[PDB]
Amino acid sequence: AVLAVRREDVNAWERRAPLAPKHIKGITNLGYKVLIQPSNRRAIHDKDYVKAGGILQEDISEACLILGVKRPPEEKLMSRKTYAFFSEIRLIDYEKMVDHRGVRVVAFGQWAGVAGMINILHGMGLRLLALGHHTPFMHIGMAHNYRNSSQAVQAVRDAGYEISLGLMPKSIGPLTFVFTGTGNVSKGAQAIFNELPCEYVEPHELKEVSQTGDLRKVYGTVLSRHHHLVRKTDAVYDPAEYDKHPERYISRFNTDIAPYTTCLINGIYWEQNTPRLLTRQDAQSLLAGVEGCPALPHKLVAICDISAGSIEFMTECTTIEHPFCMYDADQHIIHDSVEGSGILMCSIDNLPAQLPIEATECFGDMLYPYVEEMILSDATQPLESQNFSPVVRDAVIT
Amino acid sequence: AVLAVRREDVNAWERRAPLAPKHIKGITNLGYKVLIQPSNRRAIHDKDYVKAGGILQEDISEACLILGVKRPPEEKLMSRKTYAFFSEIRLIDYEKMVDHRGVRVVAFGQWAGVAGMINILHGMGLRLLALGHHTPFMHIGMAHNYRNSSQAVQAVRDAGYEISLGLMPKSIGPLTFVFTGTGNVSKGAQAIFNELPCEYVEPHELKEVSQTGDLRKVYGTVLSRHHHLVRKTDAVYDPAEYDKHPERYISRFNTDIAPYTTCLINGIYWEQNTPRLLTRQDAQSLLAGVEGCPALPHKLVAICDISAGSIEFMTECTTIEHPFCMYDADQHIIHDSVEGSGILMCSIDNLPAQLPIEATECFGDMLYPYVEEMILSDATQPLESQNFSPVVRDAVIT
């Protein structure tokens, strides 16, 4: 009954771990031995795991359970072990772990939305500067440039102060931020947004707010289903019918919301037959004063996907290293650019890795209650004789 | 006698101005009318110039003196005016303005070194992560990601705290920073460095310090002439002779200092016949443990030029938008990269533009005493009848 946390070697930016030091201290308090494979790549230092009770050791052959974040290289797999990561060995997949209602019980929580909102604010500063406008958004870095969300929140506060002081350029007009989805990632992105001088309005007020809104505030709206979903046949919205039959519905976001949106934070988790927020034809419609102080070429400036479908023209993803691309009027995707015409787009598949300490502590909190039954399992013995809960059992891939 | 501050249209990153609001208030207190051409690109907002007493006006035909930072487009030049910028019209060039000893009296001071040191610390974090090592340097953004040097200093303090807590990876070993030059840009880069847990040592101690130095500190050294300059014939250093005859001297930096240097901050202003710090052959010599915690491939990780010659293989410059490049073992320069083998290099020609408010206030402080004689000048009348000081007179290009 020995547990090991393997070293991540997926990519250079995988700095997360499946368990935090406080979780290792709890496991060692229960009487279980924990081996920690040394890793300079981890955002949490090896000495903090040692202080919690873990043993720093390269050879993890003694452990029967090996916990990692991402896939291990196939050659590094040890036979007759139980492995858990994101994908005679028993393999447990975190993403398959669900409760009796089917909701995932082990994830990174809101941190992808927190990181995504910082990134898009940073990207909006660069994009607006490329258009000729210095804004306080120039004073927000990328999410991974901050030690944690607290230090990032202070930077968002400071840029919010500049906006409330009236330091935004008057000619670009009011800024409107639209949040979609009901998951925890949308709550995380809204948490960062609430640190600005924000005012929340209903979707139907965007048309007026986008024109006459106060320039010392930013404006936000939370898009619910009933605001934009209509039946294909007669534009009716029925909550019960849409849940059972989403294929009968379309979205009027492209005409009712999109033209009045400066920045779209898309957190919708796309499912089968769910209507799309924007199509390629919508992008062409959306992309259709003084020399020193020009107006924006288009109202829509940026789109940030934090769900990692809804946006048909967003067929490619960006990375932490190259966070932004432009979708131009010729339907071309220009990678690692904020220049030219078009919409700034950000779609990073591992957002929580930009805030890896808080992402590790959140992931470990969710995983911790299922750890003990994993340690006591035996990969050589049949699955049916293991004392698993349905959460762990149904997550076994082998 | 009307003064105008034109709008900068050089590039998107030219956010500086030749005069700050406090300077405009002084000029208006003297009784002079100041026109401010509106600019969303300026880091200091138009309303702060209005509050100081300036008049926001696109047409600046009334002014006889037009102050800008960089070159104006040739078509925008107005005849029979006096212009001052960096390069029947009279043209004054800031760089030509010198005192009786020949020292420049109008410049951006230390701010290029302040910005350059932040950039290189940010670049070292990315480069070390690419090598497999998470370090606190990941929590320092680019200079232009900070509102001012105060907000940047706080981020350097916070990363310094992490280093003093022991969060650096042990396998990369001690970090040594070498500062060259005696100008104000070197003082600015040292000012940022002093916010880390630093200890200064003599150049001869680098050999030992680079091996056994405390890993909860960073180490710095200031390189003076007598540390590395030797006569070609007999390796003698004579201060008076080197000043008169630098062509008789060479630098032993490549063998005595370079092998023990983690990061070189080059502030030397290169002059005719001054010996080079490093050559192309030196780079080949410099580029000639556990799997989880490897050692550095080479001791030298990064070089940042803040002087904008000394380093023969640094034949190309980087930009604010693409700050870093790699010089590999094949003598190739890989732009916009921190990956692969080689030395990380940063050489931005307009560093102070990354801290444009403080750079503007510094530049304006130096320019302010010469402004009044420029306003009272007449570009149509002969230069010899103008009441100029030698500083302004000798700076006229026409």
Author numbering:
A (entry chain A), B (entry chain A): 24 to 110, 130 to 330, 338 to 357, 361 to 450
Sentences from the paper on this structure:
AASS is a bifunctional enzyme with an N-terminal lysine-2-oxoglutarate reductase (LOR) domain and a C-terminal saccharopine dehydrogenase (SDH) domain, which are homologous to Saccharomyces cerevisiae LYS1 and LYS9, respectively. The LOR domain catalyses the reductive deamination of L-lysine and 2-oxoglutarate into saccharopine (EC 1.5.1.8), which constitutes the first committed, and possibly rate-limiting, step in lysine degradation.
We initially purified a short construct (amino acids 21–451) that expressed well in E. coli with high purity and a monodisperse peak on gel filtration. Importantly, we solved the first crystal structure of the human LOR domain at 2.2 Å resolution. Moreover, when we tested this short construct for activity, we discovered that, despite the fact that it was well folded and aligned nicely with the yeast structure, it had no activity in our in vitro assay. We reanalysed the structure of the short construct and noticed that although the interface in the asymmetric unit is likely non-physiologic, the interface of a monomer with its crystallographic symmetry-mate is identical to the long interface in the tetramer, further supporting the validity of this interface. One paradox to resolve was why the C-terminus is so critical for activity, despite the fact that it is distant from the active site and the shorter construct is well folded.
